[PDB]
Amino acid sequence: QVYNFSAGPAMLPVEVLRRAQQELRDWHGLGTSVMEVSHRSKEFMQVAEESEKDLRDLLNVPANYKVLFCHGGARAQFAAVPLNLLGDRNSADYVDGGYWAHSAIKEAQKYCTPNVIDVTTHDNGLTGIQPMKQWKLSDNAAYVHYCPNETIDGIAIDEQPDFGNKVVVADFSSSILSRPIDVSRYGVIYAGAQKNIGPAGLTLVIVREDLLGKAHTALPSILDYKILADNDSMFNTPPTFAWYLSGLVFKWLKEQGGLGEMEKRNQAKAELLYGAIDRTGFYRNDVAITNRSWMNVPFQMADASLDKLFLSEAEAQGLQALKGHRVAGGMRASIYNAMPIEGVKALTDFMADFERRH
Amino acid sequence: QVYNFSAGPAMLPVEVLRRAQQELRDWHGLGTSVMEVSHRSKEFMQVAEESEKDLRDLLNVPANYKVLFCHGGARAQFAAVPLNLLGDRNSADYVDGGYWAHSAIKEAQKYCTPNVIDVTTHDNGLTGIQPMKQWKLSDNAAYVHYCPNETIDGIAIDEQPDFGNKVVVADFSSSILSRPIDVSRYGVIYAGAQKNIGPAGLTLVIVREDLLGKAHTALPSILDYKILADNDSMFNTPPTFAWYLSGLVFKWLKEQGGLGEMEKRNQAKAELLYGAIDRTGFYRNDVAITNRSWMNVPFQMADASLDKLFLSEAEAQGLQALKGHRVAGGMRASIYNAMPIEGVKALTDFMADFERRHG
Ligand SMILES: *Cc1c(COP(=O)(O)O)cnc(C)c1O
């Protein structure tokens, strides 16, 4: 039995993949794949509408937000955000609490002079994040940009933002759909599809409508929020298979009880794994408890000379893609929505009996 | 049997789809889909390298061109072309002979003041194109941009360019890999994958290496050819499944005998279908002989009030997605690489039966 702990692209719900396999060649009796049909067919149109509706229901998006499906991954959004949003102004506030937040800053430097606010705390060797209340924001920022779940670091910011009428932008790539969020606190939420949804080549953007209409002329059109909104995300040919699949994944999410039920399953999973790490000195995670990601769980061995053996023996027991980042070394288990608790139990059994042996 | 004449997204080769179906859930024995793994895995990196290599061999790409796999579709290249290539030049030459070449112009207006050369001819009701010899090009232009196959109009420019040290950019979306081309005559070739590869969500860009490094600062990194090239199209997460499938397409092309065999097959398929249109007054095509696309074949009926019955009866026989464009009405058959001659035959047999009835 195989479990795939890959950080992105990532496991898809087993049931979504089964259904997709089933209809790969004959979709809805048409004798063609979903992949070979026009995005303007009645049939694809339905997928496009059902999936927007299903997403609004799951996350409870208000009517004043546009729901866009975009080419280009989240790194496109690192450019598309400043281009759409800078408006008449000359910078925005960028909250820097890890790699991906840093990445966005580095692209922002093409379009502005980003005000880099470092938010990382280091109390007792543990790494955490400053409370929002003390973040040193500008009066003049076009917006405030932050990453609520840092996929490499295993650091989440769980608190909802309650800033002014400041425009908040959040890269939710690696934790979107993991629990409910209060969409109304946000200007833009974006997420590359390939992590906590699963399929690569699609990016989700959710945009408050009043923010449209101020995009810079240099912004290529396929990344213009207004243009996408005016064309129901079909200004050009969309990544249709990816969109159909994300639609399957929204269906599956509703079958499971929605994001209230995802929150419970995901807390249960994280507590299991973090528990297995914390019971013993043999493994270590050095993120502050309050800021621990449920989605991405990095960890190291007291004795790092065992990493390779740990990874090879895990893989032989079917536990795949657990290699950590170069900097930390050690391990990272990403345990997204698709990952059932039995997946995580298999990993922690394995961790236990690896410590027994060595 | 179903045959699917959709213009884009389009039919994939049947054998590619039977293979993908069989490994959808357990690829390579790993117990997982190719959709579910790192783009930085040895397994996916092997896919990436092989695909690039099979492409180079199929088209005979020379050593000094980069092969890039990109997000965004060809509409993204309408911006990515000017931003990558303008340098300190104010304008670029835009050859205009139809819809898709027109669309490139409007996007380029964001970045430059394009020089719009109207290249269409009109003789007898027959639409055609000026030979490249007489194209009124410009000396100060950053490059020349044209579309050798206009998907909606059914108009192709077969002539390979022979301009001097001018940089030629071409939108080969609807005919890349239909036949051999002399890649050395171009600066940039690009193509959305959804047609004559077939899989949507990936775009091909072939760029002469010396053209890299003049990118404007405003260009989003994911669209910067030099960045793509420096990172082998894995600057960000690629459309893994799409790229894989394209790779299957490349292998399939190789098993069929390469682009020289495609040319013969595609020739014979067009000849059959244009044969069915020409031999009777019931169907019509108003594109000059010399400019007739082999890939997209619009055509109308003498009596346009049969259109619905025709489309409807064709569908009942397994012939799908043949509706034309509304300016023209009538029909359009796209008959890309994946489509076998048998497919085109069922359409011409159908066309004959229908004319027999209602003619
Ligand atoms: C992976 C990741 C990105 C980059 O995603 P791409 O789709 O490869 O551009 C950005 N932000 C976060 C939090 C991520 O995990």
PDB file of N, CA, C and O and ligand atoms in Angstrom, chain A residues 72-76 78 100 147 149-151 171 173-174 192 194-195 203, chain B residues 236-237, ligand 1:
ATOM      1  N   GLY A  72      -0.785  29.603 -14.867  1.00  0.00           N
ATOM      2  CA  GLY A  72       0.552  30.128 -14.539  1.00  0.00           C
ATOM      3  C   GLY A  72       1.127  29.883 -13.157  1.00  0.00           C
ATOM      4  O   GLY A  72       2.254  30.312 -12.887  1.00  0.00           O
ATOM      5  N   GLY A  73       0.376  29.235 -12.273  1.00  0.00           N
ATOM      6  CA  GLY A  73       0.882  28.914 -10.947  1.00  0.00           C
ATOM      7  C   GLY A  73       0.895  30.145 -10.063  1.00  0.00           C
ATOM      8  O   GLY A  73       0.560  31.229 -10.491  1.00  0.00           O
ATOM      9  N   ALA A  74       1.355  29.990  -8.841  1.00  0.00           N
ATOM     10  CA  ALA A  74       1.272  31.084  -7.911  1.00  0.00           C
ATOM     11  C   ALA A  74       2.384  32.082  -8.231  1.00  0.00           C
ATOM     12  O   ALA A  74       2.240  33.267  -7.965  1.00  0.00           O
ATOM     13  N   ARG A  75       3.492  31.621  -8.814  1.00  0.00           N
ATOM     14  CA  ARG A  75       4.528  32.532  -9.173  1.00  0.00           C
ATOM     15  C   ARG A  75       4.111  33.606 -10.198  1.00  0.00           C
ATOM     16  O   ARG A  75       4.650  34.668 -10.202  1.00  0.00           O
ATOM     17  N   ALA A  76       3.138  33.303 -11.042  1.00  0.00           N
ATOM     18  CA  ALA A  76       2.523  34.281 -11.940  1.00  0.00           C
ATOM     19  C   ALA A  76       1.830  35.322 -11.109  1.00  0.00           C
ATOM     20  O   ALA A  76       1.889  36.485 -11.439  1.00  0.00           O
ATOM     21  N   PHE A  78       2.593  36.239  -8.105  1.00  0.00           N
ATOM     22  CA  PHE A  78       3.601  37.184  -7.542  1.00  0.00           C
ATOM     23  C   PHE A  78       3.803  38.416  -8.466  1.00  0.00           C
ATOM     24  O   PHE A  78       4.229  39.504  -8.006  1.00  0.00           O
ATOM     25  N   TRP A 100       8.317  31.365   0.719  1.00  0.00           N
ATOM     26  CA  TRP A 100       7.375  31.730  -0.337  1.00  0.00           C
ATOM     27  C   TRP A 100       6.969  33.184  -0.260  1.00  0.00           C
ATOM     28  O   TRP A 100       6.863  33.855  -1.268  1.00  0.00           O
ATOM     29  N   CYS A 147       1.740  35.097   3.420  1.00  0.00           N
ATOM     30  CA  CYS A 147       1.585  33.682   3.124  1.00  0.00           C
ATOM     31  C   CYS A 147       1.161  32.990   4.415  1.00  0.00           C
ATOM     32  O   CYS A 147       1.966  32.830   5.323  1.00  0.00           O
ATOM     33  N   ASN A 149       0.541  29.881   4.893  1.00  0.00           N
ATOM     34  CA  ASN A 149       1.103  28.546   5.103  1.00  0.00           C
ATOM     35  C   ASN A 149       2.315  28.336   4.244  1.00  0.00           C
ATOM     36  O   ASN A 149       2.218  28.195   3.008  1.00  0.00           O
ATOM     37  N   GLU A 150       3.458  28.341   4.925  1.00  0.00           N
ATOM     38  CA  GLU A 150       4.782  28.276   4.307  1.00  0.00           C
ATOM     39  C   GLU A 150       5.225  26.796   4.189  1.00  0.00           C
ATOM     40  O   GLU A 150       5.566  26.116   5.154  1.00  0.00           O
ATOM     41  N   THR A 151       5.172  26.324   2.960  1.00  0.00           N
ATOM     42  CA  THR A 151       5.158  24.890   2.612  1.00  0.00           C
ATOM     43  C   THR A 151       6.477  24.196   2.943  1.00  0.00           C
ATOM     44  O   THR A 151       6.482  23.060   3.355  1.00  0.00           O
ATOM     45  N   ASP A 171      -1.366  34.352  -0.159  1.00  0.00           N
ATOM     46  CA  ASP A 171      -1.007  33.166  -0.909  1.00  0.00           C
ATOM     47  C   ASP A 171      -1.468  31.955  -0.129  1.00  0.00           C
ATOM     48  O   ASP A 171      -0.789  31.526   0.781  1.00  0.00           O
ATOM     49  N   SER A 173      -1.864  28.906  -1.327  1.00  0.00           N
ATOM     50  CA  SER A 173      -1.547  27.731  -2.098  1.00  0.00           C
ATOM     51  C   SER A 173      -1.574  26.395  -1.354  1.00  0.00           C
ATOM     52  O   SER A 173      -2.206  25.454  -1.804  1.00  0.00           O
ATOM     53  N   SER A 174      -0.900  26.308  -0.208  1.00  0.00           N
ATOM     54  CA  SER A 174      -0.686  25.010   0.420  1.00  0.00           C
ATOM     55  C   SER A 174      -1.651  24.668   1.584  1.00  0.00           C
ATOM     56  O   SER A 174      -1.532  23.596   2.192  1.00  0.00           O
ATOM     57  N   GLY A 192      -2.162  28.202  -6.135  1.00  0.00           N
ATOM     58  CA  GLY A 192      -1.908  27.284  -7.175  1.00  0.00           C
ATOM     59  C   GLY A 192      -2.602  25.990  -6.805  1.00  0.00           C
ATOM     60  O   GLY A 192      -2.701  25.612  -5.642  1.00  0.00           O
ATOM     61  N   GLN A 194      -2.112  22.866  -7.156  1.00  0.00           N
ATOM     62  CA  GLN A 194      -1.433  21.538  -7.099  1.00  0.00           C
ATOM     63  C   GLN A 194      -1.045  21.010  -5.713  1.00  0.00           C
ATOM     64  O   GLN A 194      -0.264  20.045  -5.570  1.00  0.00           O
ATOM     65  N   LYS A 195      -1.576  21.601  -4.677  1.00  0.00           N
ATOM     66  CA  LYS A 195      -1.141  21.183  -3.358  1.00  0.00           C
ATOM     67  C   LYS A 195      -2.382  20.651  -2.736  1.00  0.00           C
ATOM     68  O   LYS A 195      -2.754  19.476  -2.892  1.00  0.00           O
ATOM     69  N   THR A 203      -4.581  27.891 -11.340  1.00  0.00           N
ATOM     70  CA  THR A 203      -4.388  28.731 -10.220  1.00  0.00           C
ATOM     71  C   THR A 203      -5.684  29.442  -9.961  1.00  0.00           C
ATOM     72  O   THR A 203      -6.344  29.975 -10.871  1.00  0.00           O
TER      73      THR A 203
ATOM     74  N   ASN B 236       8.803  27.771 -12.313  1.00  0.00           N
ATOM     75  CA  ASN B 236       7.755  27.372 -11.371  1.00  0.00           C
ATOM     76  C   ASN B 236       7.226  25.962 -11.685  1.00  0.00           C
ATOM     77  O   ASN B 236       7.802  25.265 -12.515  1.00  0.00           O
ATOM     78  N   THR B 237       6.183  25.523 -10.992  1.00  0.00           N
ATOM     79  CA  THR B 237       5.627  24.193 -11.259  1.00  0.00           C
ATOM     80  C   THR B 237       4.988  24.210 -12.631  1.00  0.00           C
ATOM     81  O   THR B 237       4.070  24.984 -12.875  1.00  0.00           O
TER      82      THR B 237
HETATM   83  C1  LIG C   1       4.538  25.913  -4.409  1.00  0.00           C
HETATM   84  C2  LIG C   1       4.152  27.179  -3.754  1.00  0.00           C
HETATM   85  C3  LIG C   1       4.224  28.429  -4.545  1.00  0.00           C
HETATM   86  C4  LIG C   1       4.677  28.354  -6.003  1.00  0.00           C
HETATM   87  O1  LIG C   1       3.710  27.608  -6.747  1.00  0.00           O
HETATM   88  P1  LIG C   1       3.870  27.455  -8.368  1.00  0.00           P
HETATM   89  O2  LIG C   1       2.461  27.021  -8.715  1.00  0.00           O
HETATM   90  O3  LIG C   1       5.086  26.423  -8.617  1.00  0.00           O
HETATM   91  O4  LIG C   1       4.202  28.926  -8.955  1.00  0.00           O
HETATM   92  C5  LIG C   1       3.833  29.646  -3.974  1.00  0.00           C
HETATM   93  N1  LIG C   1       3.393  29.752  -2.680  1.00  0.00           N
HETATM   94  C6  LIG C   1       3.308  28.689  -1.852  1.00  0.00           C
HETATM   95  C7  LIG C   1       2.840  28.775  -0.401  1.00  0.00           C
HETATM   96  C8  LIG C   1       3.677  27.362  -2.372  1.00  0.00           C
HETATM   97  O5  LIG C   1       3.592  26.296  -1.574  1.00  0.00           O
END
